[PDB]
Design a protein. Structure first.
Lengths: 126, 114, 52, 53, 68, 181, 179, 83
């Protein structure tokens, strides 16, 4: 017999017995974007939800981030995060290469050396 | 034999160092604070009515206290100390506007005297 | 092959949401109306009365 | 001091004898005639879990 | 309530007004040990509720520090 | 796609542009549920169907776009999911080997898992909507207006709880846009 | 063989790598966010659990066991962390050194004397090892994503740690059950 | 700077640095600019900045790498600058 190593779900707030009564679902989700999910009733008995798209939700996130960072300014992490929200809203594709790669290859723009060997945007035969 | 962990001292010597009345690494979590507030029969009041100020003391608001008076003027349990306590509660109002709060003090005064 | 029509979950889409309440809050610090004054002072005087 | 089996087996033998608490362990102390001292037998004042059950 | 009852009832057992105080303060002498509510938490009592309170007009307005 | 249909006109003109663009479906097939896109390829358990045939799939659990989501209680009507049988083949062998330590008996059981490999062509959806549905209070809302939130949503700070953990103040006061306008 | 015999060791001067700075197939730092966990008043073990799951990467929907992607948790105020009742005085910390005399039985109070930080590190160790033991890289790599600061002063202002708002659902105090 | 460039050998590099780290406070601003210019010569942004490696120590299982005297030379330059 071995100790069980499968992953355990986190404990969840205990009910006050109000949940036992019918017409009161025991899932409580009342959240920021909640009012935007509009419920419609199909003829089937199924439902129909109307929701804002991916980039709209992320744009809302971006607005909240900018609005919290207007006061104290934007920290480096905030910078990187805003950059990524801004990229993933406009994505149109999938990104398979590390974000740092472009910076690592373009580092020569940042740190300039002496002018004997100094590298420019054109180099050869000059 | 690390001596930072298992020092060379007997347990007889060392058992005086075991804290049995322990103070700082506290035993009461935050989640309990509210619960132990409720079992003592205390009630949360809105800011007008009163509050627990910097020394964690429950101070009753002036203009709140005067209303408690004007409800309880003639009550059987209302003793003569309650009157002077009410008046004591009215003092900052007495200073910052003496014209309209000395009338209150005089109301309590006349009512007490009768 | 793997495909998302709406989009893939990224850590930042649901991040900036906070928990909300169904019906609006009876704020602790608020200017009490007159009916409110009377009711609350009624309550305090009630418990003070039974105690004393 | 002699260790009684439980609290019921604990009696006050003299005029000056008292009930006292040794850290949640009930005991009897006489400032005169110390041979009258009685402890309720119970856990040590300092015990860990693996060390003492 | 009980301590107020102890105060306003007559002094037959113990000294009032005197500086002696026959029963001396001995916090260290008392029980040192943990009760089950020291582990499992303070016992649950019904949350103190306000029935039929009038609706909060001026819920948007902030209370001024009432020192005035 | 034949468009959504309702006895109310405003709701129809509102949700008409909502159904345009790529749709994903959730499909029950041979006790396996599938997330299904337009150009996606699935391997379902073996269907008896000629190769290169043209198939509609009956059991459809959920259909959604970038914009709308239709959650079928147990199943949906109106959904047209048209796929195309591409292959029928047995997939990579799972060799099971059974040997009892006491007995000299060894059993080699090959399980190539037979499968029908399916490419998908269309996903069309044409619901019949009854009305707007109030979700906090259970009702069918009679009148529909897009501009007003069906259920407005309120922030949590009473001031009543001292030990309520404070998330940053811009997260706690944030009001969300009107989507249907 | 695949995994080499010549292995990086603690006595070997090359030293032991830090997984935060390491670049490896199973280490993804791109999509992480920084959290701030105030430990005032919260029970040590619970804090250990929550921190363990943000750190491990289990709080994400896309979490995969072999792919270690965590969030950095800055655990502030280790000194104010509350252990219920007699437990500070009664809860053991046991380890066995391989040498004559294989028992160190050491009270929480003593560990708290030496470092408060080591207590949180200990219970983090436990809550991470509860699901990952059998591979060293899966045990050790998450733990470096904890930043344990025993009061309200931390270097990390630049990462803008978002206050992690968490209330423990468990009503009763923590219970030491270890065979 | 002349000693640094004209005799490229390791010991003259160290010998240059030990002098120009002794004298940091006792020179002006531009005199420092020519210094750092002269010193920044054998460095490529792409390349590892400070690695000067001489001895491979195979003593243990995985080979150890030992630098030469240039490392603490440059570092001593930076610490003098710090003072
Ligand atoms: Zn005796």
């Amino acid at each position: 017999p071995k100790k069980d190593r499968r992953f355990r779900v986190q404990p969840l707030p205990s009910l006050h017995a109000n949940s036992l009564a019918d017409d009161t679902p025991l899932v409580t989700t009342t959240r920021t974007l909640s009012p935007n999910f509009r419920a419609f009733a199909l003829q089937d008995g199924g439902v129909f939800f109307t929701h804002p798209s991916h980039e709209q939700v992320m744009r809302v996130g971006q607005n909240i981030l900018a609005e919290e960072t207007k006061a104290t300014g934007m920290t480096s992490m905030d910078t990187y995060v805003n950059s990524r929200i801004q990229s993933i809203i406009a994505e149109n594709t999938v990104e398979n290469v590390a974000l740092s790669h472009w910076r690592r290859r373009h580092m020569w723009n940042l740190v300039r050396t002496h002018g004997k060997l100094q590298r420019h945007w054109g180099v050869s035969d000059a | 034999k690390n001596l930072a962990w298992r020092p060379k001292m007997s347990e007889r010597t060392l058992e005086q160092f075991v804290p049995l009345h322990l103070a700082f690494p506290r035993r009461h979590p935050n989640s309990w604070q509210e619960r132990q507030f409720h079992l003592l029969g205390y009630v949360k009041w809105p800011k007008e009515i009163g509050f627990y100020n910097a020394g964690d003391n429950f101070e009753l608001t002036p203009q709140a206290a005067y209303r408690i008076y004007k409800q309880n003027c003639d009550e059987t349990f209302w003793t003569r100390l309650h009157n002077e306590k009410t008046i004591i509660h009215l003092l900052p109002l007495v200073e910052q506007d003496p014209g309209t709060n000395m009338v209150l003090v005089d109301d309590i005064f006349r009512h007490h005297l009768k | 092959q793997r495909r998302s029509v709406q989009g893939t979950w990224n850590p930042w889409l649901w991040n900036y949401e906070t928990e909300r309440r169904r019906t609006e809050a009876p704020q602790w610090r608020r200017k009490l109306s007159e009916k409110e004054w009377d009711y609350y002072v009624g309550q305090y005087s009630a418990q003070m009365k039974q105690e004393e | 001091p002699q260790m009684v089996m439980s609290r019921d087996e604990l009696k006050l033998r003299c005029e000056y004898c008292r009930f006292e608490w040794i850290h949640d362990t009930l005991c009897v102390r006489c400032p005169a005639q110390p041979s009258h001292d009685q402890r309720e037998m119970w856990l040590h004042s300092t015990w860990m879990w693996g060390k003492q059950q | 309530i009980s301590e107020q009852v102890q105060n306003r009832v007559r002094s037959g057992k113990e000294l009032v007004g005197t500086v002696y105080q026959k029963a001396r303060r001995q916090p260290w002498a008392k029980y040192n040990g943990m009760f089950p509510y020291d582990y499992n938490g303070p016992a649950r009592r019904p949350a103190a509720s306000f029935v039929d309170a009038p609706t909060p007009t001026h819920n948007a307005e902030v209370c001024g520090t009432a020192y005035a | 796609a034949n468009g959504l249909r309702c006895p109310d006109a405003l709701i129809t003109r509102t949700l008409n542009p909502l159904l345009n663009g790529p749709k994903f479906a959730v499909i029950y097939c041979g006790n396996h549920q599938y997330k299904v896109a337009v150009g996606d390829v699935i391997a379902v358990q073996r269907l008896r169907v000629e190769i290169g045939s043209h198939i509609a799939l009956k059991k459809v659990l959920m259909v959604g776009g970038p914009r709308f989501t239709a959650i079928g209680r147990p199943l949906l009507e109106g959904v047209r999911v048209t796929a195309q049988v591409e292959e029928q083949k047995r997939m990579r062998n799972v060799v099971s080997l059974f040997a009892t330590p006491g007995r000299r008996h060894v059993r080699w059981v090959d399980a190539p898992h037979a499968a029908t490999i399916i490419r998908i062509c269309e996903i069309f959806y044409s619901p019949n909507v009854v009305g707007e549905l109030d979700k906090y209070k259970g009702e069918l809302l009679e009148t529909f207006t897009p501009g007003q939130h069906t259920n407005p949503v309120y922030p949590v700070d009473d001031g009543y709880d001292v030990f309520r953990k404070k998330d940053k103040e811009a997260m706690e006061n944030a009001t969300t846009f009107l989507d249907l306008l | 063989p695949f995994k080499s015999v010549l292995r990086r060791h603690k006595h070997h001067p090359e030293g032991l790598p830090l997984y935060n700075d390491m670049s490896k197939q199973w280490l993804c730092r791109e999509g992480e966010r920084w959290w701030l966990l105030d430990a005032r008043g919260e029970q040590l073990p619970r804090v250990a659990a929550v921190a363990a799951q943000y750190i491990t990467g289990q709080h994400r929907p896309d979490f995969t066991p072999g792919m270690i992607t965590g969030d950095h948790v800055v655990i502030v105020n280790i000194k104010d962390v509350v252990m219920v009742g007699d437990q500070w005085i009664r809860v053991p910390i046991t380890w066995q050194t391989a040498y004559p005399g294989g028992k160190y039985r050491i009270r929480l109070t003593d560990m708290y004397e030496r470092d408060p930080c080591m207590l949180m590190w200990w219970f983090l160790k436990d809550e991470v090892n509860r699901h990952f033991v059998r591979k060293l890289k899966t045990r050790i790599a998450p733990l470096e994503k904890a930043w344990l600061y025993e009061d309200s002063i931390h270097p990390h202002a630049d990462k803008n740690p978002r206050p992690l708002c968490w209330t423990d659902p468990e009503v009763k105090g923590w219970k030491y059950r270890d065979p | 700077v002349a000693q640094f460039e004209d005799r490229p050998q390791i010991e003259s590099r160290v010998a240059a640095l030990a002098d120009m780290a002794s004298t940091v406070s006792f020179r002006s601003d531009e005199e420092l600019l020519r210094m750092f210019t002269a010193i920044s010569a054998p460095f490529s942004v792409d390349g590892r900045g400070l690695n000067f490696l001489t001895v491979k120590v195979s003593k243990f299982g995985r080979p150890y790498y030992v630098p030469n005297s240039l490392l603490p030379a440059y570092v001593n330059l930076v610490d003098a600058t710090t003072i």
